[model samples]
Target chain A: QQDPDPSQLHRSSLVKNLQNIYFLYEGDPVTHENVKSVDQLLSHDLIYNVSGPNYDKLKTELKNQEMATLFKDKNVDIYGVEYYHLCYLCENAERSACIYGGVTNHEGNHLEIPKKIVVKVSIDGIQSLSFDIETNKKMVTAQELDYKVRKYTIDNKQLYTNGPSKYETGYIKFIPKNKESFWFDFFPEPEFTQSKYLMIYKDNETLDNKTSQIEVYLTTK
Target chain B: QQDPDPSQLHRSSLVKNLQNIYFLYEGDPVTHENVKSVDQLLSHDLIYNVSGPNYDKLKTELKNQEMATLFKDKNVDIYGVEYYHLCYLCENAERSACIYGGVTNHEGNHLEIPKKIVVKVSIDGIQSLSFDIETNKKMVTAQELDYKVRKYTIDNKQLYTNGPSKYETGYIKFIPKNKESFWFDFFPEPEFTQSKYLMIYKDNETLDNKTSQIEVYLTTK
Candidate 1:
C-alpha cells in the first residue's frame, strides 16, 4: 500500500484516518470515576503495543504537544504485523503460539485486565481475522516449504522473509483455512537489516518492496 | 473514532483510500515479470480477510463485473478481534496458558487451519482509544479536539462513565448498535454487528445525532 500521495494528502481524510488508531486496552473504567488524566490509560498491566497511522504532520503536531506519547506509552509497543506475519503465527494456533509479553491478571484478579485486543495486522492482505484457539508456550514453530521458510517466536515476534538469498524456481503458497488469511511484509533481508525481522506494516512492506520486490505469495489451488 | 464528514470528505484522499485493499501475494516480481494484470497482485495462499472504505457505487461497479473476487475470495475468512477476548489468554501465558493459540507456521508444508497459529495482540481496551468533541462545539473537524480520553458525567441525569469529559468535568462517547441498552463486550464499542469493512461511505447529515462535526483529540502518557 502506498502512502497518501504526499502532495495530495487530505488533512480531513488524514484526520479521519488518524482516528483509525486502535488503543488496545481493557481495564477498570477508562477514567477513574474521580480522576481525569493519562493515569488510567497508562496504568494497565497488559498494554501491548499500538498500530495505526503515522501521519507525519499530525503526529508531528501531537509530538509537539508531547501527546504523541499516547500511542507511544513507554509501556506500549508499536509493532505492525502484516499478512505473512500473522499467517506465520495463525496457521498453528491451536496447539501453540506467541502471546502478549506483559503481565495482566495476577492471582485471581484480572478484572483490571483486558480480555482481548483488536490486533492491527492484516491476514493475507485482508483486514479481518478471528480464530478460537489456545497458546503454545514454546519458543518458535517455524516450518519449511519448497521455496520459503516460516518462523515464529515470542521474542523475535515478527516474520522474517529471506528472499534474494532464496528466491528460486517456485513461489510462496498461503492457503487460508478457517479465518486465516495473509499480508506479506517485504524487503531483501540485506537492506532491511533495520527491519529487525519485525515491522510496522506500511514501513516494512513499503521499505522492503521499494528496495526490492522480493516477497511473493499465491492464492489459487 | 469518527470518520470524515462527507461534505468535508476529500475525494482525492478517498481516491487514495480505495486503493488499499490487501491482495495477498508473493512472487518473482510485482510485474509477475511476464504479466502486468491482476494475476500476480491477487495470487496468494492465505488471502484471509479485507477491510477498507466501502463505496457502494465503487463496489457496485466491481461487484457488477465482480472483481470483488479480489477481497471476495471464497477462501478468505473475516473476523474482527476486539480487546476483551485476547486478554482472556494473556494473564496466564507462562505455566499452563491457552498454548494460547492464536500461531503462525508450524510443521506443515501444508499449513492447515484445524492447524494452529498464534499472534501477539494489543490488550489495550476501547477506553484508551476514543476521541471526539468535548463541548457541544458544532462544526468540528476531527482535527479540532484536544485529546482522545475517557472521563465521566451524568447522562439522562445519572452518573455515567465514558461520557463527555466533565473537565469543563467530562467523558462523552458514541454507541454503535442494537439497544437503548448495553452490549457488555464494549463499554462504548460501536455496535459493529453490521456490514463489513471497505466500510461504505456515509453522507454527513446521516452520520448521526449530528450533534458534533468530526473533531480530533490526542491521547498520551
Candidate 2:
C-alpha cells in the first residue's frame, strides 16, 4: 500500500497493487449458463422507488409496520438480510439483476444473451462465470463461486457502477416449509448524494411492494 | 493470463484491472517526494540521413557496429558509447544500472510531481496504464542469441528492440575478476519495425560509464 522509496525507486519494481471483491450468489440462476442479464429487469430507479407514493403505498406501509409488530410482540418468524457495499459495486450485474421466468420455456424473448458465448467470457474472458446448480430456481446457497464474475448480463452490454443507477447483485436461498431468505447487495452510486439503501422487491402481490424488516448500510473505506 | 468471462463480466473489476502493467518495475515513476509519475521524460521527433554526410546518422551507424562488436566479443572495452538512433532522447535514468546526478539543491526549486500518475491511449479511460519499471541492465554470459526490433514504451515510452536508440536499459557487470556477462529481459509487446543496438551516454564524462547489458519486459498482466 505504501509507495516505493523515491531516492532509490527501482523503476522496474514500482507497480500498483490490485484489489478485488466478489459477490457470491446462493446458487445458479441457470443450470448450465452462468450468465445473468441485467437488462431483463426493470429500471433500478423504479425498483428502489417502489416505496414511493403509489400502488397501495399506505397499505404496504401499514403491513410493514404490522409485520414489525409480529416480530417484536408476537415473537413470529423474522429473518433479517443485509448486504456488503464494496462487493456490490465490484461484482453486481451492472445496472440491474437477472430476471428469470417462473415457468420454463415461457421466458420473454428480449432476454439478453451472449453471441458466441461458449468460450467467450463464459469460459475465460470477463464473462466467464458459471453456476454451481443444475436446475433453474435452485437455491442461492447452491450457487458456485468463480474467480470470474458469477453473474453477468447477456450479450456484450457493459454494466454501469457510478451514477443514477443503483447497482445490485443478489442471492436467493429457499428455506424449508414456509419462507425464503433473499440477500440483495447494492452499491447506489447516485449523483448529488451518497445515501444508498439496500432493499428487497416483494414477490407476492398480497404482501407489500416493499418487504418488511429491510436492512440499510452506510459505509466508507 | 486469462481474460475475464464476458458472460460474467465484472465491469468494475475490469476497470480496476486496467490500472496497470506489472512486469519489471511494478508501477509508475516516483519523484523525490515518492509521488508516482507516468509523464514522458523527453519526447521529440528525431531525423537522420546517413549517406548525405549526416554526422548524426554516421555516428549512430558506427556506434551500432561497436555495440555489436562488444556483444559478440567481450574483450573490447569501449567507453563514451553511443547508439545507432539519430536522437538520444534521455539517459536511461529510469534504469537500475543507470545513475542520476548533477541535480543540485536549488533551495525549494525541485521539479514538482503529483501523487497519482496515469497514462492512456485515446482517452478510453480503459487503456490508461500505471507506469512501471520495464527495463534494467545486468550482465549475462555471452551466448549465441537472436535479436529483433521490438517497439516498447514505459507507461508507454517508445523503445527500440532490434535497432538502436538513445536510451539504455541494460547494463554490464564486471565482477571482482573481470568476468563478464550481458543479459536483458524484455520481450517486446508489439514487434518493432527496426532493430535496436546498445548506446551509452553519461552526461558527466568523468564518471565511469561501465560496461553494461539490458533487460526489458512489458509490465503486463
Writing each residue's lDDT as its tens digit, candidate 2 over A1-221 gives: 22222232111111111011112222222222222221111111111111211121111111122222222222111111212222222133343222111111112322333211111222111333322212122221111211112334211222222222122222222222334434333322111011112213222112111122222121111
List DockQ, one per candidate, in order. 0.02, 0.01
Residue A209 lDDT (model 2): 12
lDDT of 2 by residue, B1-221 (tens): 22222232212122222212122122221112112112222111111221221121211122221222222311211111222222332453221111111111123322244222122221122344333212111211121011111213422354322233223222211122233332232322121111121211211111111332223322222
Docking class of 2: incorrect
Model 1 chain B: ten consecutive residues of lowest lDDT: B24-33
lDDT minimum window of 10 residues, candidate 2 chain A? A54-63
How does model 2 score by TM-score? 0.16
Q: State model 1's lDDT.
A: 0.19
Give the runs in model 1 whose Cα sits over 4 Å from its true position.
A1-176, A188-221, B1-141, B144-221
